[model samples]
Target: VNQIVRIIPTLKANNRKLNETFYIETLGMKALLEESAFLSLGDQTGLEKLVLEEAPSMRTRKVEGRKKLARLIVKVENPLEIEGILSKTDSIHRLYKGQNGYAFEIFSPEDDLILIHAEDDIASLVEVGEKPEFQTDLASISLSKFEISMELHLPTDIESFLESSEIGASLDFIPAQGQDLTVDNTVTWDLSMLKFLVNELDIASLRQKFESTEYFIPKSEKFFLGKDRNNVELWFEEV
Candidate 1:
């Protein structure tokens, strides 16, 4: 079986204010890279979070109602004083206590939900990113991701995701115990939206071999797109 290289789940955003405020100032993570269509942020590790371009008129697919990400779970030093820290912002959502733990839920400009957890052993890849620009004493101030959950609303025979034969390696499965591709609260994907920079490849071969195909057909030589088994969106772009 061939293996997929890497699955970089991007945080698609339509606005920058919330993302800049929440991630840079509130969390203290460093901005690794920023572009017109994407903003790459990280701590001490290599890649942490990706902010991609999204628009209501990205109208390439037919979807119902409002669409956004599932949830992003983060671990901080202390859970108790989170409200005090966020109190400075009126737009932030109210803090709520859940059966699992105490959390403050907030919506992004892109309509995604973010949940901060208050558990222990908080050693994180964030410690791997960079020194925080702003430090908070409310908790340990050491924050990192507990899990990143996403929902890609495309459905097709994504054999590449199921196996890595094309990439010539065994791809790892991000998992949880239950259905919905969730367990331990990791990346829950119906099919994760991953972007890569590549030269002209056979976009036509996908439809030639698979059934019930859908496309975001492009007038340019570079446009190729499809969804996964559960009808989750995935995009392939020209580098």
Candidate 2:
């Protein structure tokens, strides 16, 4: 656990040009780096980050029904700053006020659902508005930092998977009853909330550990991708 540095969620960008504008210009994420394959963005603070992989080979994944990506929830001091910027764009948007503060939701250029929450000086909050019932659960998990809600592919026993994986040993996992929240008709949910861990990740060992699952390891070898029982695509990277 101490060896772990950070956990960053990666997104496959269908349209790099448009996604870049939505993440940088609209959402206020600083352009960390831009490469031929991917564009990395992070908050002004270095604690959180997101990667938009523009590579054609990696974009079309999730050989299932509708391609499912992680639902990103970013918490900040003031979401209105983002809302102010979004008003200038044609992005579909909505705002919700909870017991603790306000949450602003918007669709990225890729139509990925992102939530920017601005909170008051409090621990967490429950929902009280027209938002879905899942907002309450989402707010609680995202109160401390950013969260990614992913759907699992194969039928996985999350408890056993976490117990068996080396990376899962250091996680602060919260298991909850499974619930569904539809965003733009896309369903996103899992029985638990978690993030990938990293520290000289051994792709070979990881593959052996979860041999039943398939992984997408790129040429760079910086990170390897996998799926869980919850229908969520995950990236396990070496820091």
Candidate 3:
């Protein structure tokens, strides 16, 4: 019923090198920021993959039937080369083939099937302009767009949560035949960290309503922390 704005998912990268290779080198995404505790990778258009933060000694909740990443459909300039690069270490699953081109799927180290679709092949799925978003090289590929898919147990409740919170409005949600939050693939409840920018007026109310267990002031902003029904870490900071 209230607006929850500027929500972004965060992932953990314990093995920074492998994570960077998977996201930045192979996927052809940009490393927007790199620090001791934070590593941000995003597309050229500012669509982020996720914030790979360092969470030492941090633990996750073990919740049965909790949601996780179903798949991540990424638009790439050269699927074959990228597939070849990934094939060296990971197994490739050529998921679909269309008139324009074909798409292949590979897994990240953790919980996600990264589907690399040819740039032309994604026209029907996602709107992509002709201009390439990344630089091309033999060691790396170029990416244009991406879509997140979350596998949900009870799609209705999570759907309602996103809806009532006003976060779902900004995203392009597609209808798939099976049980997923969206047709593509998305995140995990255990590693599901979402940062939100909130109006100060609603900060305390939102925190209390969400039953925030802890609070912290990181740098300038005060962040109220809590977990949702999906066991996702919801941290709200005032703008």
RMSD per prediction, one decimal?
Answer: 10.1, 8.8, 7.8
Local distance difference test, each candidate: 0.44, 0.51, 0.51
lDDT of 1 by residue, 143-173 (tens): 4432333332212222333333442221223
Candidate 3 regions off by >4 Å? 1-6, 55-67, 73-91, 98-100, 118-140, 147-149, 152-190, 197-201, 211-223, 237-239
Q: TM-score for all predictions?
A: 0.48, 0.56, 0.58
- Give the alpha carbon lDDT tens digit for every residue of 153-196 in model 3: 33443432344335553233333332322222222223456666
lDDT of 3 at 122: 49
- TM-score, structure 3 vs. true: 0.58
- Assess candidate 1 and give its lDDT: 0.44
Model 2 segments more than 4 A misplaced: 1-5, 55-67, 78-92, 120-208, 213-238
Q: What residue pairs are clashing in model 2?
A: 151-230, 151-231, 151-232, 152-230, 152-231, 152-232, 153-231
> Weakest 10 consecutive residues, lDDT, candidate 2?
182-191
lDDT tens readout by residue for model 2, 77-110 = 5444534443444544675665545566687755
